[PDB]
Amino acid sequence: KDMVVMLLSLLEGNVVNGMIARQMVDMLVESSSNVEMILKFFDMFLKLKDIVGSEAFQDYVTDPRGLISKKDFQKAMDSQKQFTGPEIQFLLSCSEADENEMINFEEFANRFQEPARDIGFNVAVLLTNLSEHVPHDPRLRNFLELAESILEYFRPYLGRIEIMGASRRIERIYFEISETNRAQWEMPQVKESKRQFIFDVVNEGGEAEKMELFVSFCEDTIFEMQIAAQISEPFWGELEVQRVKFLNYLSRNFYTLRFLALFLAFAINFILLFYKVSDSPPNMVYYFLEESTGYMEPALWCLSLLHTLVAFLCIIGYNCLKVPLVIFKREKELARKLEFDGLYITEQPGDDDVKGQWDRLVLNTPSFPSNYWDKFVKRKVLDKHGDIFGRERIAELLGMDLASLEITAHNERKPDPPPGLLTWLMSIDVKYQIWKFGVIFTDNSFLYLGWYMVMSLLGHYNNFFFAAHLLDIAMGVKTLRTILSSVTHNGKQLVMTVGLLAVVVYLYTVVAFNFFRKFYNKSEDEDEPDMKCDDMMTCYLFHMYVGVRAGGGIGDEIEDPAGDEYELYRVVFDITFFFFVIVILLAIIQGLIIDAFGELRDQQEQVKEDMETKCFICGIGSDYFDTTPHGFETHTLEEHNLANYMFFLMYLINKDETEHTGQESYVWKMYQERCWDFFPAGDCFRKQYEDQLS
Amino acid sequence: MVMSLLGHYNNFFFAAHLLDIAMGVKTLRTILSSVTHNGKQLVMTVGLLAVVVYLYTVVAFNFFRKFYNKSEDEDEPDMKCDDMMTCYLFHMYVGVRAGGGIGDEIEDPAGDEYELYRVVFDITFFFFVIVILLAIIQGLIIDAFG
Amino acid sequence: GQWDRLVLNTPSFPSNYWDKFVKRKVLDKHGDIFGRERIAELLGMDLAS
Amino acid sequence: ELRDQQEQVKEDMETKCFICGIGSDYFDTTPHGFETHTLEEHNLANYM
Ligand SMILES: Nc1ncnc2c1ncn2[C@@H]1O[C@H](COP(=O)(O)OP(=O)(O)OP(=O)(O)O)[C@@H](O)[C@H]1O
Ligand SMILES: Nc1ncnc2c1ncn2[C@@H]1O[C@H](COP(=O)(O)OP(=O)(O)OP(=O)(O)O)[C@@H](O)[C@H]1O
Ligand SMILES: O=C(O)c1cnc2[nH]c(=O)[nH]c(=O)c2c1
Ligand SMILES: [Ca+2]
Ligand SMILES: [Zn+2]
Ligand SMILES: [Zn+2]
């Protein structure tokens, strides 16, 4: 593996048909027999593992212990036909035959897979790199054919990305992808967050800003993966372990709890449909359920209790699941503003931003960099902006003692923590806790869950308050959420046009009050008349209430003006009212809402179309790649996969800096400098090397 | 064929065969396919309309019961919101169909202590249900066709 | 796919479609790594026929 | 149509330089290329 790493290092910064790569191919050709022997070793052992996994082999073996005779083992593989006779003999030699000549295929298979994984992966990487950099050579293709099974086995782990290389030339980078990393990426909530992020950037992000947003999303996804790993599960102490198990179970089942709460609200409301009111008990009216069985009243009581309990459990699960992500994002953005921009040092917003003002409390606190990974951001901020405000000013701003960092740098001291409730009591930092509670209470999802719980308690007070929980299914479904968001998408225009409608109706009311008072009587009886325009407020309310709702306008409601001296002015008044208010303004308000709905749906479709048409990383359209069949599909799947970019970032984080290669170190330095020039921008490996490839 | 045999049983069952000309013509086939082109959205928005009408029914049942009498005769009254199921059916049946909303059907609240809340209730019903949600369902069908 | 399982055993499966030798081609393709007899019983062929 | 005219005017300003008429895409090859071109190289405020 070390030798192959040296060869790969020789291949760093190599162009297509490079002289280094050609010498490597010639050297492989000179040692072709030994290379084939190595590849045969790897492929035979991989095939042996798949065969001990194979049903035909399991049928061949008849021992209850699973031990197979050398003769039976031989006939089993020759039944599989993947191995030739000398290969079978060599496998028999490799297997440690006991005195009965019995063979344990499980240990015979897993004995060599673990040691050979690293070297096999490196060999696959080297062969892939050589094949892509020297595409025309037939000897390389032969070597690839022999290593076909190894390449197939390591394909899901082999990650490739292209970076904007150091030499101002596009380079392709090969790296390992962990099985755990891929498994966490395949998680449905991670996929949902990825979809949300993609929609947000493609809708309202510029290309230059989009790399920074993408890197921030990668960091948030890494933290979310850590949260998921922690919450996943394979006398103060026993109480504590039970409590953490309970919290983890709540966090894992948070969406299930939400759905159960929705179902409980539906059942409660269905029960409520049977409610009826009668003056007689089951001059004050009595509310009681009307059912023959009589089970429904206790059923409703238990259902309400269980619904409130489930709402409380949902709040706890949300605190254990999403609040860490919220705090992580806020701490990360605060740290970056503190260090790269010197926000509270240089900028010093004088109540410019409410979030910025709130963030002032946490800077002094010792526990500020807790949730976010960098615990040295305070020290970095000090080293950056100390000189031109002074060490002591930055120290008092960030709540550091200056001698503490020096003594920690000089040596490490470990204090023992007492396992006491009080010892945990002054362990708390009230300023950080207050800032965290403010951040949580400013969160829309937490506020929604709190309103849900409050409405559940109010439902315990009066059962009909449980009807408000039926609104949750609206925000649960994307179409209904878009419907709700449509009314606020054009909210300013809606408010202004409603105001204009009110103004025009007020003018019509003024005209009616001055002249057309007689027609506004709404009482048929001569003895008792009721007048709408005898009072200006009454007539204004009458107009806004009945005229706007009426299809023909106010003239439908008020009395016919036939045979009156004001008849022509009155018909003009009615017709103009019906034209301006019923037709134009109501149509405009309806149009605002409906066009908001349609515009949001078109935004969804446009985001999907843009993803299908352009590569998200390099920005080149699908048409250029599509000249080669499935060209865009391959480009997005292997060459420029954003999942591969995230995997590369995680791999860089886990890997040791001393172990970083040249390209890895270069990308790591750009990443810590927050410079995104390494991302390919309008350029591709196949675009840069198109002539040499062709 | 089954409908033809049922038409032999009763002649009016032959009326169902008139639907065949619809699927025969491309324009009518597109009209039929439009209602299913956005079927999931249609079902969800109809459910949301039912939910909002149910909330309005709950409010009316709790407070505005008196206005819901639909009998002019003093001796024999009939009540829609005396029972929650009855008032829900009354809403979904008459309020949605009415152009002005439920307030057109129910009795005028003039000179009542609940008059302002009731006019707010009627106006919001007419805005949310008659205008927005019905317009959205119509839009789903028509935009599917187009 | 579940419904199509019944027709594989039947002798008349390739009737309507033109290739009457698709069973034999499937056997020659995937016999070795399941065995001749397994593909034969799957497609309802006698091997000697 | 009037509202679409407003949006189209805004979009045209975002897409093309007001002085030279070259689209944003040519400048955008260099990062923030159009922003720099409109801010220093071809600022109509600078022309005034
Ligand atoms: N750089 C990129 N990396 C990955 N995917 C990209 C990139 N640029 C564009 N895409 C598009 O992103 C899409 C995401 O694929 P995915 O399968 O996860 O999506 P989906 O919403 O499940 O639908 P579908 O399977 O129809 O694409 C791909 O279809 C691809 O065309
Ligand atoms: N030659 C040009 N000179 C200046 N601005 C130009 C030119 N060509 C196009 N523009 C565009 O004019 C816009 C005017 O910028 P300004 O900040 O004044 O506008 P705004 O209406 O406040 O909105 P915004 O800040 O979102 O651009 C710029 O965003 C720029 O893209
Ligand atoms: O929390 C972690 O595992 C973690 C540790 N260190 C990190 N370093 C870095 O530069 N970026 C990260 O995203 C990161 C994450
Ligand atoms: Ca090194
Ligand atoms: Zn690309
Ligand atoms: Zn210009």
UniProtKB/Swiss-Prot annotation, chain A:
Disulfide bonds: none
Residues that coordinate or bind Ca(2+): T658
Cytoplasmic side: 319-436, 478-492, 598-694
Tissue specificity statement from the Swiss-Prot or TrEMBL entry: Detected in skeletal muscle (at protein level). Fast- or slow-twitch skeletal muscle.
Binding positions for ATP per the UniProt entry: 191-195, 611-616, 636-642
Domain EF-hand per the UniProt entry, residue ranges: 55-83
Modified residues (Phosphotyrosine): Y520
UniProt binding sites for caffeine: W373
Effect of I554T: Loss of channel activation by halothane and caffeine due to Ca(2+) store depletion, probably due to constant Ca(2+) leakage through the mutant channel
Lumenal side: 460, 514-536, 557-576
Chain ranges for the short sequence motif Selectivity filter as given in the UniProt record: 551-557
UniProt modified residues of type Phosphoserine: S523
Post-translational modification: The N-terminus is blocked. Channel activity is modulated by phosphorylation.
Subcellular location: Sarcoplasmic reticulum membrane
Function: Cytosolic calcium-activated calcium channel that mediates the release of Ca(2+) from the sarcoplasmic reticulum into the cytosol and thereby plays a key role in triggering muscle contraction following depolarization of T-tubules. Repeated very high-level exercise increases the open probability of the channel and leads to Ca(2+) leaking into the cytoplasm. Can also mediate the release of Ca(2+) from intracellular stores in neurons, and may thereby promote prolonged Ca(2+) signaling in the brain. Required for normal embryonic development of muscle fibers and skeletal muscle.
Subunit structure: Homotetramer. Can also form heterotetramers with RYR2. Identified in a complex composed of RYR1, PDE4D, PKA, FKBP1A and protein phosphatase 1 (PP1). Repeated very high-level exercise decreases interaction with PDE4D and protein phosphatase 1 (PP1). Interacts with CALM; CALM with bound calcium inhibits the RYR1 channel activity. Interacts with S100A1. Interacts with FKBP1A; this stabilizes the closed conformation of the channel. Interacts with CACNA1S; interaction with CACNA1S is important for activation of the RYR1 channel. Interacts with CACNB1.
Family: Belongs to the ryanodine receptor (TC 1.A.3.1) family. RYR1 subfamily.
Name under which the protein is recorded: Ryanodine receptor 1
Organism (species): Oryctolagus cuniculus (Rabbit)
